[PDB]
Design a protein around this ligand. Sequence first.
Ligand code: HEC
Ligand code: HEC
Ligand code: HEM
Ligand code: HEM
Ligand code: HEM
Ligand code: HEM
Ligand SMILES: C/C=C(C)/C=C/C=C/[C@H](OC)[C@@H](C)[C@@H](OC)[C@@H](C)CCc1oc2c(O)c(OC)cc(OC)c2c(=O)c1C
Ligand SMILES: C/C=C(C)/C=C/C=C/[C@H](OC)[C@@H](C)[C@@H](OC)[C@@H](C)CCc1oc2c(O)c(OC)cc(OC)c2c(=O)c1C
Ligand code: FES
Ligand code: FES
Lengths: 206, 206, 428, 428, 174, 174
Amino acid sequence: DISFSFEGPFGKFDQHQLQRGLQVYTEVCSACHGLRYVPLRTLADEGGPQLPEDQVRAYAANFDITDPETEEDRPRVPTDHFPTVSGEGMGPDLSLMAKARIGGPEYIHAVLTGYDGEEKVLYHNAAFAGNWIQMAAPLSDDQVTYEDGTPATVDQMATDVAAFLMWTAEPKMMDRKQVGFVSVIFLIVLAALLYLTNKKLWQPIK
Amino acid sequence: DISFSFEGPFGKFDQHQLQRGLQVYTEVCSACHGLRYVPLRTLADEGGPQLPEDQVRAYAANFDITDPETEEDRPRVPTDHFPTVSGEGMGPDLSLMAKARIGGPEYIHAVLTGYDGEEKVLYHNAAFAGNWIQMAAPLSDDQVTYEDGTPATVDQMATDVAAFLMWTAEPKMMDRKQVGFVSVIFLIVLAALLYLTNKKLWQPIK
Amino acid sequence: GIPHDHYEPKTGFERWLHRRLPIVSLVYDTLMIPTPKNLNWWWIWGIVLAFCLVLQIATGIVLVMHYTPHVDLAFASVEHIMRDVNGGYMLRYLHANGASLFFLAVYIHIFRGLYYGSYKAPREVTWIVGMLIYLMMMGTAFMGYVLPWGQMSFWGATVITGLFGAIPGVGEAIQTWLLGGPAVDNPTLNRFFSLHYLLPFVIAALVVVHIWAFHTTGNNNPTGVEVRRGSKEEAKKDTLPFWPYFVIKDLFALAVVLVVFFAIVGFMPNYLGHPDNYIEANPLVTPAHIVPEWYFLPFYAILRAFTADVWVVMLVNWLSFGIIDAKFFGVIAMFGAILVMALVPWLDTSRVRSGQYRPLFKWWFWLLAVDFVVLMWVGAMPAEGIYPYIALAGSAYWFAYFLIILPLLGIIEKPDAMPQTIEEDFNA
Amino acid sequence: GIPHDHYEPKTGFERWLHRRLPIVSLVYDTLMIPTPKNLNWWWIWGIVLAFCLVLQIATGIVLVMHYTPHVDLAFASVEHIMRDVNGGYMLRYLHANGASLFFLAVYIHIFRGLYYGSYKAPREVTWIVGMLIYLMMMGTAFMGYVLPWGQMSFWGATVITGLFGAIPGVGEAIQTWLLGGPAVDNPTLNRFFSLHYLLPFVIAALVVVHIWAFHTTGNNNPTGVEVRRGSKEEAKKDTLPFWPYFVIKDLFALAVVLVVFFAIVGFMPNYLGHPDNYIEANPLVTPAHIVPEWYFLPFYAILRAFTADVWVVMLVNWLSFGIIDAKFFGVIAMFGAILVMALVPWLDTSRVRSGQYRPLFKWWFWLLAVDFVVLMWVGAMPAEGIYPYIALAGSAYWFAYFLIILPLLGIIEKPDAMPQTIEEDFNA
Amino acid sequence: DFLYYATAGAGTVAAGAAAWTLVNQMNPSADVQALASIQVDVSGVETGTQLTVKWLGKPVFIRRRTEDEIQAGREVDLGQLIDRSAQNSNKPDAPATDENRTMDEAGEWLVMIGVCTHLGCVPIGDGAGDFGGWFCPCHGSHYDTSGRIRRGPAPQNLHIPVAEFLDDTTIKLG
Amino acid sequence: DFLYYATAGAGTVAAGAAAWTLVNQMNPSADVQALASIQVDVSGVETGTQLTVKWLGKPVFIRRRTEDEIQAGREVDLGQLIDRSAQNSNKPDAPATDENRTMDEAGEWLVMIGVCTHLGCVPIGDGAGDFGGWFCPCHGSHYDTSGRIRRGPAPQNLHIPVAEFLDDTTIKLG
Ligand code: HEC
Ligand code: HEC
Ligand code: HEM
Ligand code: HEM
Ligand code: HEM
Ligand code: HEM
Ligand SMILES: C/C=C(C)/C=C/C=C/[C@H](OC)[C@@H](C)[C@@H](OC)[C@@H](C)CCc1oc2c(O)c(OC)cc(OC)c2c(=O)c1C
Ligand SMILES: C/C=C(C)/C=C/C=C/[C@H](OC)[C@@H](C)[C@@H](OC)[C@@H](C)CCc1oc2c(O)c(OC)cc(OC)c2c(=O)c1C
Ligand code: FES
Ligand code: FES
């Protein structure tokens, strides 16, 4: 039960953390895990890492894609999805993990952080299958340098990419919390006026 | 305005002509033309060329396909469709031509049979979209040896592949005619009983 | 209303049921409604329409079980319906030709009504609900047609979504909205598919209200002379119960229609369509011979007749300061062609009902009838005069008829002599 | 029928319109039906259901515009709806929780009925139409749940199509027919999509027949004492017009319900579903924790409760010479669970209507109610005893209640003293 | 009034033929009807391991049983069973003893349609369940070490498909 | 009865917000608003030839004109023309002369969005139509050699896109 900027009804992603997490993703997770349902351009949007266009464009450019219409590769562009990853020794796509496992980002963090050392080619894990995951503990310290100081400790890294993963799952979380706020407040007002109206319609009869 | 066993209400395909036409296809047209909507297994159905199983399978074998779930090539099996052809210098898919052009098979025939010699890389043709086609005359005589001894004259071959192509467009022509026959006759009988009933009902009133 | 006689529960079940849901009373009233005894064969087209609605929907629901509304798979999915699905080819040709049968039937139905004054008081409402259904049928049919995603489907979708972008001011928006983006593409396929499924249900509803309204006024009849309301004995003299008399006469007519229909489904399945829809949509090429679906041709003839060359076009173009050009004029003329027909109860000011008894009328009506076929036929001919001229004449005759001829006649025409009553008419 | 004052046209238009389609008379007799004035907050779940019906359809038509029913594109299409469509996520979450509000409301609705005798003469038909709607809702909901083609969709689809394959003799064929082949696959996805679209329209029709029935008998009320029909002055004492009085009580209550609904939709959009449907159908693995949709949990519970171990199952397996094994029994027991609820008007032989005045009833009824929640609960717990025992007790109570307890009280029980008129009740 | 029967009868027929087309388009279509053989190469699967291959929309289990499982299997008396049948398509009326369950006259190879005979879930293996066989999470069915149904609603032992060895290191399905 | 208004009012609002939600989902969704530039290779296009390339779900026409078409297009007087606007994005404000229409001073490179300004069919070229430019088969519009609209329903000259030459052989669209 660690916590994040975003649980609760007034929660919001933390942009920086989200970028830290994107970076952990890029530099570590993406070798074994894809994100098919995430279009690269969304990295740009209000409510997420919100990198700026030219960075998102630069970032997109490090990924390869076999052009359907053609048949040559080209570097990726913002309209493409992150790559789909798979084959042998390759993990479940992660675009929805935070929602698929409600305790989502905690489970990702629990798992990344839950290797003891054992090896029955399985590996003991506090949080998985109970308790042998086939994913060799993927993170060790300062395995990433954040342009932003933050000590790249394993716990940190697991946390950032958990937040980041939460956002690939619910990109519209902020929108959805905001609209929800206005709907509820609006219905509460409405409920109230129908309440009075209704009361006034009824006092003469009671 | 040639003629075919299939035109008219009582017309059926000629199984042998269809075989001759498929041979013409396989040996001349498939270089430049696919039949994506024709699944190889239907080469064995009633109402068509109707090869035996083993031969359909043996036939499917001469074709390659990139296995979707694999990535390895492999000879084709009857459940695959014929290949899809396209690129520089390739022709429109042929599966539906005989209905897309009603005098469909006539058009195919009139076109294979309407090259006058001239060139421009176009080629004067009697029957095309007036009158320059980008298709070098595909047929010349004895360009094919029919196992059944029909003179492989250009005219013949144009006619056979034309029938064949009528079948790839309407593989169900014969079920349709036959269901047609049974419904019209049934309705005519129904119409009659309803008429007599209506009459018996309205006599006392009139 | 017409003196009729109400339902009478007898059974154990019926007494029980009637106290709690008087559904058997409702059926009975619908099926026993006193119908003028002198209806002629022009009256059978309502049942053919009902049949067609029920046919389109039944085949429709079931086609959707094997169809995929995606641009990479739509056209392949129709092919797999033709070839692999039990009775597939037949369901497909049923649903497509059914649309044609549907449209023949309305045009006929509509003209029966235009001739016999079935839109005149007190039947305005039956008529407006008619017109609405009509509009819905066209929308519905346009969208189904898009579904195969062939060449006609795709350039159809373009042209028709284009009608809206002609509106001044907001047309670019309504157009972006309908398209789902900057061009006829997958979003367009995807939303039309939804509406194609939905609209036929709205049509069934409107049809319920349709039948309700003519049950309210009572049917019209060839003479234009109402059933007598003065007592039971004489209302009986003018009418018969819809069941069994007209039910079985319609069922018969229907069968005869269905003999032809199945003949076509069976032996000339593609004769009413455009071969080109057997080629896969291509966003770069519109085929040289792109002819609208036949039941759309008159309206299409009206539209393109109105080019820059046309003088009413330059007149209006000038007066409106450029805001109404040929493109917009053409669109206003085509929807206008439909609307004035909607308005005919208020345009036709002759107090006489049935055309049967109006001698000047018959001529003008029949010219309308020819107009309509001739527009249809010109819709299929290319621009290059003399066709434009024919199309121009036809349009003008279309509006002249509703706007000019019909009102004048109210003033000038002399009714022939009508029968006193339907029982009278019937006896000859 | 209840003396009520009927619609009278004044306006010129209303006079015109009344003669040709008396659609305003219809609206009036609906919004003005005389309602018992003593209704309590239980009477509001009907309007909440109507709301849900209109909400599932509205959001549904609109989701279909961006959804693709193909096994290779279904899941991606839901993801594209969530991410790219204007308001996508919100509509998606509305339609999903929407289903849950729907079932929340029917169960409550239903239980009100079972408590207050709203199925007893003369309201049997209302109830039976209620039960059709109920069956239909369940079928509808299952199919929709396949649509995203997640792991739950797929194994859910396998399992429920499995129920039909249990029928001896004809089950493999019904199974092959529903599947469209030897396994849940694209044909399955593709037909459930059609039916998901169709069924909600059939449900709307039944709901029209539903409202019609209660208008015919009149609403029930907490006392079970019918509105007086002796004169208008009496009936007025016992009732009030549905409009403005209950339309507004209703709209207010709905508003309070929607306050929670949107809270959930805004902040806990996924707490009422299974995470696991965020993973893509995999035909090689069924997931270890596979729990049905909550609204299905009691009937599901009734299902597994019946293993080979169970004595009634061995007795019946034996008597039946093997034709009824635990597999068939469990299915029968499950649809049986639903059916015996359907038949309650002919099982509850007590002549007193309302549970209020039944003192042995109040007990068995709450037990029933608890039973239902407890069953929901176990369905979500592992087989592994002591839950099977809790599940078996539960079921046996469920059948016991309709099959034994209710007929018993026919004879055993003694009504406490009722108020004599509704107006009586109200004054207290 | 013979007119009446032919006419009503004809209607009937028209109605039935209509209803049937509507019903019959849902039966397997022609492409879906090719149920071809296949060959899984089992050269890979070590011991106490199960490979799972897609065949016909459904999983197939191929397990190489450990010593004990073959033992465990062989104990168990016909009479202790729910399904005395060996549900085996190439020993087609055999009893449900272990020997009629495996391909090899020797006990080691366990080939099964990995479909729960209850309502078609896929039972979890690696000896999950009260008989370290398979447990099927859908309604709690436990299968024993030779795939026989021991506890729950499932009425039959996991079936065995037409199947043999081609090379020593290969298996042919159907 | 200020109560009345706040209640009717909010009723209305919830209705508006409900309708806008249903209406707005149909506006182009996020993955569709990426209208990216692109770049054509025009080194292959011989004189008197048109290249057609999809851009933005639509055809772009790139024709390399013959010297007759250039002349033909240069003869016409602003006055004989239906649309006097050059409909040019790279000259948003100019006359419909020939020189305002092409990309180059020589009049050789006529680049246009290839969509009849009438109702969107792709007009046919290779000199088709009464003015040896393009003919649009959908309602009979004829465009001349500079793609200017001469006869029919279409109100405008085929548009000229944002475009220019990078290298000799490469045109940059958008
Ligand atoms: C290859 C060395 C990997 C790298 C680097 C990462 N992961 Fe992985 N992951 C891998 C495998 C083979 C699996 C399947 C585990 C199994 O045997 O089931 C996984 C799985 C996960 C999971 C969850 C699996 C589940 O719950 O079913 C998560 C949440 C996950 N992986 C996360 C993750 C992160 C955040 C990584 C970047 C630090 C990462 N993994 C790297 C293989 C590999
Ligand atoms: C390459 C050597 C070809 C072979 C061999 C065949 N065809 Fe072909 N075909 C080819 C091209 C490049 C085209 C396009 C022609 C055009 O400019 O539009 C075609 C076209 C056709 C058509 C009609 C197309 C139309 O638009 O009406 C038909 C009916 C056709 N081709 C048939 C056909 C047959 C039956 C062949 C076997 C003898 C055959 N073609 C061979 C290229 C080539
Ligand atoms: C008023 C009733 C209807 C009309 C007028 C109508 C019209 C049409 C037309 C003209 C086509 C194209 C025919 C073709 O060339 O293939 C079509 C296709 C289609 N229709 Fe309908 N339709 C109606 C009802 C329905 C309904 C209720 C459904 C719901 C399932 C439906 C589903 C389909 C489908 C899936 C297609 C594409 C398959 C095909 O092209 O045959 N239709 N419709
Ligand atoms: C879905 C399409 C339609 C259906 C199913 C339908 C059905 C019917 C039926 C069964 C009748 C009564 C018998 C008859 O006169 O044929 C009828 C009558 C009538 N309909 Fe239609 N109809 C449809 C479309 C239309 C349209 C498009 C119009 C006008 C634009 C129209 C106008 C009328 C009129 C004026 C009558 C006569 C009412 C009377 O006799 O008083 N209907 N319709
Ligand atoms: C789509 C689901 C349904 C809708 C929209 C609906 C609608 C309504 C409405 C508006 C009422 C009247 C006011 C009220 O008491 O709440 C009502 C009453 C009633 N409903 Fe439903 N209902 C539905 C489902 C059901 C079901 C599933 C049942 C039983 C299985 C049922 C049984 C009844 C009964 C017995 C009444 C009482 C009639 C009376 O008081 O005379 N309803 N329904
Ligand atoms: C009684 C009314 C309805 C019920 C009870 C119902 C139930 C459901 C359920 C449980 C789902 C899956 C929810 C999820 O995604 O987790 C669903 C999905 C879906 N429904 Fe419905 N539905 C109803 C009405 C409709 C209607 C009329 C349509 C017509 C378009 C429709 C279209 C869809 C579509 C396209 C999906 C897949 C997208 C999605 O999963 O959200 N629904 N439905
Ligand atoms: C989302 C739902 C929508 C947007 C519904 C829109 C409905 C619009 C109208 O009905 C109400 C419309 C269908 C109706 O106009 C009255 C028809 C008579 C229009 C006839 C029509 O057809 C064509 C067609 O079929 C074509 O095929 C290749 C091609 C066409 O040009 C080349 C046309 C065309 O130029 C016209 C005018
Ligand atoms: C083509 C249309 C068809 C075939 C319609 C069929 C309708 C059937 C019934 O409605 C009438 C049915 C839906 C209804 O039973 C009465 C429900 C209460 C059944 C509840 C139900 O759900 C499950 C479920 O959701 C699951 O999710 C992953 C998994 C399940 O096992 C693992 C089940 C399950 O074991 C049961 C009993
Ligand atoms: S399906 Fe395996 S136990 Fe129900
Ligand atoms: S769209 Fe080109 S002329 Fe109408």
